[PDB]
């Protein structure tokens, strides 16, 4: 009989059962969405949006609900930290319930189509056999896609009838769902402009409507019909797998590099924000602004928000995880409780020392303290027999401004070395490590896990495209080559490769 | 010695009604004993 | 809750092993 890897071919020439299997897959996806959201809601901690947001808790589908406008729960909390809002039905729980109920409806519809497979619509009136007019189906589905895309851009995204989408400030402190106006200039192709996403859906939906109208009124050329094997549904499978891995590579890239559609309050900061010191630069700019206004160091550092300092921490970079370091980021360092404040390290001669930060590449990193002109003045030596720049000899003390340790000075070298190792990771935080029994190794964020899954799936779907494209274009020889094939494969006999009428006869 | 075919081989059947009854029995046994397994 | 650490594996195996036995026997029936 059929080999295992071909069992699903039974619905290749059965449009009713093909529709039924599609419904079953659609039901399973919608039910996964509902059940995953329900599990995330059951284990979500809404108590502190600042230091325990969704991306520290492993929340995968909750940022996607939040991105398009669903920020509140029935219980009463919102992911923006606001309380007492009334979302109506379309809270997180209501959306999860709607996907579960949709999954059940699609399961029942799949059962019906499986059982009543032999519908009169699926057979050709001209011949007697099952036939799908795939260019016409493409034109209808394209027209539906264009209508839905235009409605999503022009009503939902703009807030004309809908919530809008999630926007934030450049540093992810004031994120909320708002109506977004379309940007029709070249700044609409700025990937961090949400008005670009709004214009895209409006314009691409209009173009999809026009293209669907063309693909609905105009039959394919005979050359393109024969070249692309348009009677075979496997050519649709091949090109759709191609478009699907294209879009998966795109979403993995936009997840990893950051986008207006991948805000850092929902998925976590990017690795490139740690790489170039983005949050550290903004924190230093705010502190320098308060110092120029005429404030003290404690005053300047006590108006840095704890959220902004929490972004400036390598344990929130998505490039510090492990493949089998499973789960939430709170299972790693712990649940963040409070910012300890900014350390200033000074050696015994009064020079200000900066701990060199741990790059994303390094599992471990040496502790190095350099002065203003890039000369190493202190370190934590491995060998102490020829140590010169240890904390003990150099007399490095550390004074903390802002945070929990504001106004404090530590001169005992063990405390100074501990705070140096903390400052290596960026802004230091106190962590609760007993709630989830945190093991101390960093995890990656939902941004990193999304990028990994979608990159891997896009790579594997490249093979799917090649496989199905090859199965499409080589359907005639799938059982094997012709039992002859002798004279055409000889060299020099025919002028053109594979052409019988091009025999040189010489 | 030779490896001869055994004539006492007989097929095993389990019909669909028996499958449903067994699946329901196994499901309700899991429902009954899971709380005690967790304790 | 402080449950038995083996409760999940015992519940899944207690359900799944005879489920598998029944499915094996049903699917091969008629051979």
């Amino acid at each position: 009989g059929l080999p295992w890897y071909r069992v699903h071919t039974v619905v290749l020439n059965d449009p009713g059962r093909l529709i039924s299997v599609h419904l079953m897959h659609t039901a399973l996806v919608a039910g996964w969405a509902g059940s995953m959201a329900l599990y995330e809601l059951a284990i979500f901690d809404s108590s502190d949006a600042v230091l325990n947001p969704m991306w520290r808790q492993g929340m995968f589908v909750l940022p996607f609900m939040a991105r398009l406008g669903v920020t509140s729960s029935w219980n009463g909390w919102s992911v923006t930290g606001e309380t007492g809002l009334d979302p109506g039905f379309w809270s997180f729980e209501g959306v999860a319930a709607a996907h579960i109920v949709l999954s059940g409806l699609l399961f029942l519809a799949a059962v019906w189509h499986w059982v009543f497979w032999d519908l009169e619509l699926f057979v050709d009136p001209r011949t007697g056999e099952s036939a799908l007019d795939l260019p016409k189906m493409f034109g209808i589905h394209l027209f539906l896609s264009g209508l839905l895309c235009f409605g999503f851009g022009a009503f939902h995204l703009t807030g004309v009838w809908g919530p809008g989408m999630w926007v934030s400030d450049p540093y992810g402190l004031t994120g909320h769902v708002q109506p977004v106006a379309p940007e029709w200039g070249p700044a609409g192709f700025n990937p961090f402009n949400p008005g670009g996403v709004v214009a895209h859906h409006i314009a691409a939906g209009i173009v999809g409507i026009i293209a669907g109208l063309f693909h609905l009124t105009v039959r394919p050329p005979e050359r393109l019909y024969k070249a692309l094997r348009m009677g075979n549904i496997e050519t649709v499978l091949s090109s759709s797998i191609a478009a699907v891995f294209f879009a998966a590579f795109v979403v993995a890239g936009t997840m990893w590099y950051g986008n207006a559609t991948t805000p850092i309050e929902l998925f976590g900061p990017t690795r490139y924000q740690w790489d170039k010191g983005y949050f550290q630069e903004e924190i230093q700019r705010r502190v320098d602004s308060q110092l120029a206004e005429g404030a003290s160091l404690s005053e300047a550092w006590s108006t840095i928000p704890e959220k902004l300092a929490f972004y400036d921490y390598v344990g929130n970079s998505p490039a510090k995880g492990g493949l089998f370091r499973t789960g939430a980021m709170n299972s790693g360092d712990g649940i963040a409780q409070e910012w300890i404040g900014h350390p200033i390290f000074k050696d015994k001669e009064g020079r200000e020392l900066e701990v060199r930060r741990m790059p994303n590449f390094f599992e471990t990193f040496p502790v190095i303290m350099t002065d203003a002109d890039g000369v190493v003045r202190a370190d934590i030596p491995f060998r102490r027999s020829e140590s010169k720049f240890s904390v003990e000899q150099t007399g490095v003390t550390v004074s903390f401004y802002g945070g929990a340790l504001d106004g404090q000075t530590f001169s005992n070298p063990s405390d100074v070395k501990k705070f140096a190792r903390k400052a290596q990771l960026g802004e230091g935080f106190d962590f609760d490590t007993e709630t989830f029994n945190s093991d101390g190794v960093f995890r990656t964020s939902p941004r990193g896990w999304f990028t990994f899954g979608h990159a891997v799936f896009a790579l594997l779907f490249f093979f799917g495209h090649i496989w199905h494209g090859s199965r499409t274009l080589f359907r005639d020889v799938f059982a094997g080559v012709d039992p002859g094939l002798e004279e055409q494969v000889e060299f020099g006999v025919f002028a053109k490769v594979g052409d019988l009428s091009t025999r040189k006869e010489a | 010695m030779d490896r001869n075919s055994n004539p006492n081989r007989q097929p095993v059947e389990l019909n669909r009604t028996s499958l449903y009854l067994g699946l329901l029995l196994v499901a309700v046994l899991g429902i009954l004993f899971s709380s005690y397994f967790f304790n | 809750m402080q449950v038995n650490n083996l409760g999940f594996i015992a519940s899944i195996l207690f359900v799944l092993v005879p489920t598998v036995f029944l499915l094996i026997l049903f699917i091969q029936t008629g051979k």
């Binding site: 599990y39 059951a42 | 019909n15 329901l24 499901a27 429902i31 | 999940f8 519940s11």
Partner: peptide, 30 residues
């Protein structure tokens, strides 16, 4: 996490009930 196990086993029983009603072997007079 035991709640997941309880939900799964109750769901397995209810799915068995659905498939035994909807997809029974039909009783045939012969």
């Amino acid at each position: 996490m035991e709640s997941v196990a309880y939900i799964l086993v109750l769901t397995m029983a209810l799915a068995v009930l659905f498939f035994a009603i909807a997809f029974r072997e039909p009783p045939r007079i012969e």
